Write a protein that holds these residues in place. Structure first.
Motif, PDB file in Angstrom:
ATOM      1  N   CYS A  17       0.813  -1.207   0.000  1.00 42.18           N
ATOM      2  CA  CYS A  17       0.000   0.000   0.000  1.00 42.18           C
ATOM      3  C   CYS A  17       0.850   1.262   0.000  1.00 42.18           C
ATOM      4  N   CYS A  66      -1.311  -7.586   6.717  1.00 49.25           N
ATOM      5  CA  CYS A  66      -2.084  -6.357   6.651  1.00 49.25           C
ATOM      6  C   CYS A  66      -3.572  -6.657   6.569  1.00 49.25           C
ATOM      7  N   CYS A 102      -5.142  -5.038   2.966  1.00 53.44           N
ATOM      8  CA  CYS A 102      -4.802  -5.683   1.706  1.00 53.44           C
ATOM      9  C   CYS A 102      -4.681  -7.200   1.782  1.00 53.44           C
TER      10      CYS A 102
HETATM   11 ZN    ZN Z   1      -1.730  -3.131   3.125  1.00 57.90          ZN
END
Ligand code: ZN
Lengths: 59, 93
Positions: free
Chosen positions: B14, B71, B74
RNA sequence: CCGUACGGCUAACCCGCGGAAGCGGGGACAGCGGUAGGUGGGCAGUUUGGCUGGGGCGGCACACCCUCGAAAAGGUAUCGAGGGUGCCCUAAGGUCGGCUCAGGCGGGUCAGGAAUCCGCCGUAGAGUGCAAGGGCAAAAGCCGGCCUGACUGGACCCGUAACAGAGGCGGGUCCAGCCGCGAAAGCGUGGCCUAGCGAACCCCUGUGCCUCCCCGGUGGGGGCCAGGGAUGACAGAAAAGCUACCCUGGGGAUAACAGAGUCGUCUCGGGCGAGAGCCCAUAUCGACCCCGAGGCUUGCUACCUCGCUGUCGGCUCUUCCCAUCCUG
RNA sequence: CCGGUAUGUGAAGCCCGGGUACAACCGGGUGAAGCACCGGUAAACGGCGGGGGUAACUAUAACCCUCUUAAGGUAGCGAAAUU
RNA sequence: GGGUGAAAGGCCAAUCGAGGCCGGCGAUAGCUGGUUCCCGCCGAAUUAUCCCCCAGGAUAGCCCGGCCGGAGGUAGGCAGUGGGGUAGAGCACUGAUUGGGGGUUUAGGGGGCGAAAGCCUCCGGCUCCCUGUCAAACUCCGAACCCACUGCCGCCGUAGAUGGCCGGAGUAGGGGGGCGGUGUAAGCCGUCACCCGAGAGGGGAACAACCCAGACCGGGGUUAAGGCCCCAAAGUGCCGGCUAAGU
RNA sequence: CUUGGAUCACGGGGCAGGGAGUUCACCCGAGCGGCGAGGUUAAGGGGGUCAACCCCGAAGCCGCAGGGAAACCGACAGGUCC
RNA sequence: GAGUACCGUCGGUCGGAUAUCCGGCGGGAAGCUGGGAGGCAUCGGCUCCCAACCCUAAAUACGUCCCGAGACCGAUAGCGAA
RNA sequence: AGGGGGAACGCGGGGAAUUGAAACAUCUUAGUACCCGCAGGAAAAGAAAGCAAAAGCGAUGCCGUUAGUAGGGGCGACCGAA
């Protein structure tokens, strides 16, 4: 290592072999294929010492 | 030694700071389909002395951790530094 | 359908008696061939470390940190002296703010009283995650608040390892990214500094890409990057002993013995005088302290000699010293 | 060393399921000998325990408290080719 | 690796804890011995890190030869900018250590008049002052000395230094002497880098390293260390004094 | 050999003849020589006065462009100064 | 052109690596509307071929013999042997 | 018809250890030494169920390169084609 007496006996050497040329022959009865149903008769003619037998034999 | 279940860290994917959950890596055994195990089995066959070194029970009492940080945004995991040695490891919330 | 266990049978196979036809006994077991596990010095190949005031047992100060040794730059060894580490912490880490410690004295309830209350003095005697040394007071210590720079991609330097070469390990100065504390300047790439760990090959996980023999799909395999799993004999073999039946090559670089050196120990002396001796220091005996000779007692060392002779004691034979038992 | 029960475990193979247009592979069950478990065996290898207190005076202690194991040196011999 | 053995590892053609012959075989060793003509030019090392390493080897340090390049370099001294805690000294920190003169008395068992830990004292603790002693792992002080750097004096260098590249090695058992730690000592372990090693000649009676002095060949002179009664070149030398023990 | 040899450390009766860094393959360097952005032939073949001599033969090898594990991508034959 | 091609497993061997060849054991085809190979297996294309029966010169290796030649030795040399 | 003999060269089977890896067990030494069998003046092989890859070749054997390459391997020492 070296060998044991019980392993050397299996080789079949003079040190271990029986002297059966000295003995009287083997002892067997009469074959069935010649005494089938006949009931054979015999006479004892000699009693002998046998060196390989532990028992006396008769002729 | 206590460690939190949640950390706000840089995510390489990200390309910003996000929340990550912490997990220990859980191992698995050698695969038979690998070339190295093919070679080892090919050397073990037939009439042979044993062909490779064999250390019986070789182990350290205190090992390092292998942690992955996953994460939430994501769904992907990544590594974060080198491992450190500690005997007790406890994830507190 | 296929099985397992059992019971029986005879015609394969096996055993015997016989020129062979057969006969009798066993029997789909055994034996034979193929494969899988166990037991297995009966038989083989090997290993069985090093340092070391010889070797052996002992001991691992066999990798690291601090003080001394160490000779006021640097460097410097011994089975040299004194001690510690092979971890712990989501806080003991980052930052911002505020505050100041040990002890002593004078005041009060209390047996030693551990401690809570008040004032003054007070250069750190305290405290610091941990040894030792260093450092630190409007803090690097105490009390609180918000946080996770204990991160991603990269560069150049120093040390281990001076001068003077090094894989791996550790540390320093920065550039970018994304973030934290803070009014802001600023600080932050773990722990105030110096200990707390580890090649090749192989494997497991994460991640996105490259690839597998004429071309194209599917399953599976190989490669690049990052993290992890261990070798403490810690720059990393997978590993127990006996030899007096012993063998080879070597060594006085290394023990036993004679020699050489030294004399703690030993033997032989001396100075002073505590005093003992009816009284009287020394007719005789002489404490405790201090100064020496000898190398015939044992040890210490390792200069000479590893196929010079390696031998103890006794018998035989010669000579020398006096530190005199007898004889003057 | 021998024997006995299997309750466990136990390799290949066989079976069940998944996986693969087929395999390789993955997870379960069954699975002998052996290991484990129960027992027998010393003219089998081998083993066979100290501090303590006490009698008509100095003594020593038949014996009594005792402290643990599979068991705790019997008859004999004994400074011995063993001191 | 078989025989045979009334068992000693005994014997199997002078051979046996695994025969003899030929072959593999010119086996291998980090261990031992050896390695063949002359003259010139230069000329070392036995110390750091790693290795199942310690009688062996590798990477560096110390030697040689050649090339490149093109102006500074440096083994000594003077003056300066900075650094350092040794010798010595002392008690200002840490810790050791004698005695007195006082004040608080008690952290504490002893008793005393202890009617009871008592108002109060005795052997003792706390804080001073005067006296006396210490430090490899103490410092309020603090040299000689050493190190880096700048400028000058001196030396080397265009007849090419410092430096860099290429190549060929040997060396990984050192010793005497001076310094330090250890040890009764002899010695052991390090350090300096003058000598021996790898160094002739002249002296110390002979002597690896003590003194003088560094060596092509033939000659002539002067000195060094030391020496001058004889051995033995040169003084039975001079002045003042001591020794009677062949010291 | 050794720190150290006249050593009570090893080898050393006399003389003559013999007796120890060789060859190949690969790699690193040098001293010279030929051609030169190119250089060089191997096996083999043809001729001759027939193991010597002359001619042919570039297959291949090195170099002329590198970086990268790989897919792949792909440069100054001179701009300034001492 | 059948215990053959092919599969699995064991032993040996090979540079042959999940992809070399040989042998043993257990299974085991199609067969002209047929069969095989293309470096893991399999599916589809394309390309190349027809095993499991037999013979075959020349170009090549050697020299217990013969022939020629030699910067080979020259009687302790040279083959062990003049 | 066969049997026995033949230096080296030839075909088919069986098969070590020294040694190197600075020890050693996979590896190496090595399909070597040696053993057994079978032929000739030569033997063996040999006429694609092949090699290749957008092009094509056309039985076997030998020489030079391909190449210390692909590849094997305590991925070590070393081995090693078409
Ligand atoms: Zn992420």
């Amino acid at each position: 290592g070296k060998s044991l007496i019980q392993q050397r006996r299996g080789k079949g050497t003079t040190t271990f072999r029986a002297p059966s040329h000295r003995y009287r022959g083997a002892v067997r009865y009469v074959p069935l294929n010649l005494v089938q149903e006949r009931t054979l008769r015999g006479v004892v003619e000699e009693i002998l010492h046998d060196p390989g037998r532990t028992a006396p034999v008769a002729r | 030694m206590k460690y939190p279940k949640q950390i706000r860290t840089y995510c390489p994917f990200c390309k910003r700071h996000t929340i990550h959950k912490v997990e220990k890596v859980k191992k698995r055994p050698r695969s038979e389909l690998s070339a190295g195990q093919r070679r080892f089995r090919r050397k073990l066959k037939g009439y042979t002395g044993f062909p490779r070194p064999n250390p019986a029970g070789r182990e350290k009492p205190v090992k390092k951790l292998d942690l992955r940080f996953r994460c939430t945004v994501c769904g992907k995991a990544h590594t974060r530094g080198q491992g450190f040695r500690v005997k007790k490891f406890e994830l507190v919330e």
